[PDB]
């Protein structure tokens, strides 16, 4: 991977997303989607291992099918209204079609089996990229079309998203896999409030984003892929594993940490709109997230784990790659609750 080639892949991915959240013509939205697709496949193949080839192939198939169904919705609402402008749909089945087309790109409904696997395949930096940047475009499209989305569809889809997100992560030790399942749960979390008011899903997107960088940067600052590998890191990096623990507390949403604020906001606006049964389901099922969160915490910091003899010469070497933004990345993802009113800035 040529450094300059890697940079030009960075910015074509980012420009593909930018085209999505700045364009108005529907065709341009599709173009940005595949620009990002065509641009992110090579970086996922940076390591060039057969697992990476597997992950890239599954991503390609899923996202290509999803973009083709995206054009199907595109063509249908064009046919029934002759207007490429992105707005409320004028044909119902076109709206549904776009809903599953985007969802397959998000990993919400049973169209979510790709993400845990593809996260397993690629390197952790590619994992950060996949689970942070490749959500902004589909969320932005879903925000722009919130006028006419079948509320039943979006609600049930978010419900499965969070539910299988919680359940799938229980029996996973690979940190990449449990992070993928947690991201699926957060996907359900924001997409549940997507139909009602998009400011709150934007806020939850921001919090999940900052938490995800604050997470992945800690992982590859510890260089761990399995739970046992992270457990061995309780020694070398005690500060890193303590911050590991505090952000793992911010994971579930235990007050007064940052992660509680989006849950609180989403539930409060859901209750404003007579949806009282609905919020209790994610409120209960967040304990499923908190379960393997607590398991990760126990393996990381709360309980000392048996280290290794050779491991001691690691004591002689220091992490040289700075991996900047980590301090503020932690801080914004831990203590921003007294700043909840600032949500009105996004509105």
């Amino acid at each position: 991977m040529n450094p300059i080639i890697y940079t030009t892949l960075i910015m074509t991915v980012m420009s593909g997303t930018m085209l999505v959240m700045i364009s108005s013509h529907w065709l341009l939205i599709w173009i940005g989607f595949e620009m990002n697709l065509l641009a992110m496949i090579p970086v996922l193949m940076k390591n060039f291992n057969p697992r990476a080839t597997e992950a890239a192939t599954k991503y390609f198939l899923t996202q290509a099918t999803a973009s083709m169904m995206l054009m199907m919705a595109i063509i249908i609402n064009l046919l029934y209204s002759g207007q490429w402008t992105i707005t409320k749909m004028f044909n119902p089945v076109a709206m549904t079609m776009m809903t599953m087309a985007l969802a397959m790109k998000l990993g919400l409904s049973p169209f979510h089996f790709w993400v845990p696997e593809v996260t397993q395949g690629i390197s952790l930096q590619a994992g950060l990229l996949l689970l942070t940047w490749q959500k902004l475009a589909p969320l932005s499209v879903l925000c722009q079309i919130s006028q006419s989305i079948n509320p039943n569809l979006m609600l049930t889809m978010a419900m499965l998203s969070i539910l299988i997100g919680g359940w799938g992560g229980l029996n996973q030790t690979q940190l990449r896999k449990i992070m993928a399942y947690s991201s699926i749960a957060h996907m359900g979390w924001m997409t549940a409030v997507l139909p009602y008011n998009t400011t709150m899903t934007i806020l939850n997107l921001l919090i999940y984003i900052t938490m995800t960088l604050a997470m992945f940067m800690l992982l590859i600052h510890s260089s761990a892929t399995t739970t046992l590998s992270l457990s061995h890191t309780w020694n070398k990096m005690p500060v890193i594993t303590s911050l590991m623990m505090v952000t793992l507390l911010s994971m579930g949403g235990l007050p007064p940490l940052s992660g509680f604020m989006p849950k609180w906001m989403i539930i409060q606006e859901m209750t404003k709109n007579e949806s009282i049964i609905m919020p209790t389901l994610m409120a209960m099922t967040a304990l499923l997230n908190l379960y393997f969160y607590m398991r990760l915490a126990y393996s990381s910091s709360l309980t000392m784990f048996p280290s290794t003899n050779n491991m001691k010469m690691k004591w002689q070497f220091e992490h040289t790659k700075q991996m900047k933004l980590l301090p503020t990345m932690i801080v914004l993802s831990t203590l921003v609750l007294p700043m909840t009113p600032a949500l009105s800035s996004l509105n």
Binding site: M21, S24, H25, L27, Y80, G82, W84, T87, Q144, Q147
Partner: protein, 99 residues
């Protein structure tokens, strides 16, 4: 769009093609230029969830100009009755219908 840089920094980037009453090459009007002009100028600065009901009759007139569902259904009914009574044999089409 989410972040409309188009009208902020002041240029068209994609809005030229979005609708078919825009300035088409060499003034080639679309099939439903009149109907979509009526619809667009009907619903301007009104709000989608408010304009969708005031600009309704324009909207379905536009959709019927696009698809001709109602008109072609009417033609199908006419052809059905014509072929039925011709098979059961009452009148003959006037010479303008033959040659």
């Amino acid at each position: 769009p989410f972040f409309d840089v188009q009208k902020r920094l002041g240029l068209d980037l994609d809005r030229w093609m979005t609708i078919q009453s825009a300035e088409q090459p060499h003034k080639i009007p679309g099939r439903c230029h009149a109907f979509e002009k009526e619809w667009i100028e009907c619903a301007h600065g009104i709000g989608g969830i408010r304009a969708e009901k005031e600009c309704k009759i324009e909207f379905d007139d536009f959709v019927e100009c696009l698809l001709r569902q109602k008109t072609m259904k009417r033609l199908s009914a006419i052809k059905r009755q014509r072929d039925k009574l011709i098979k059961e044999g009452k009148y003959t089409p006037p010479p303008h219908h033959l040659g």
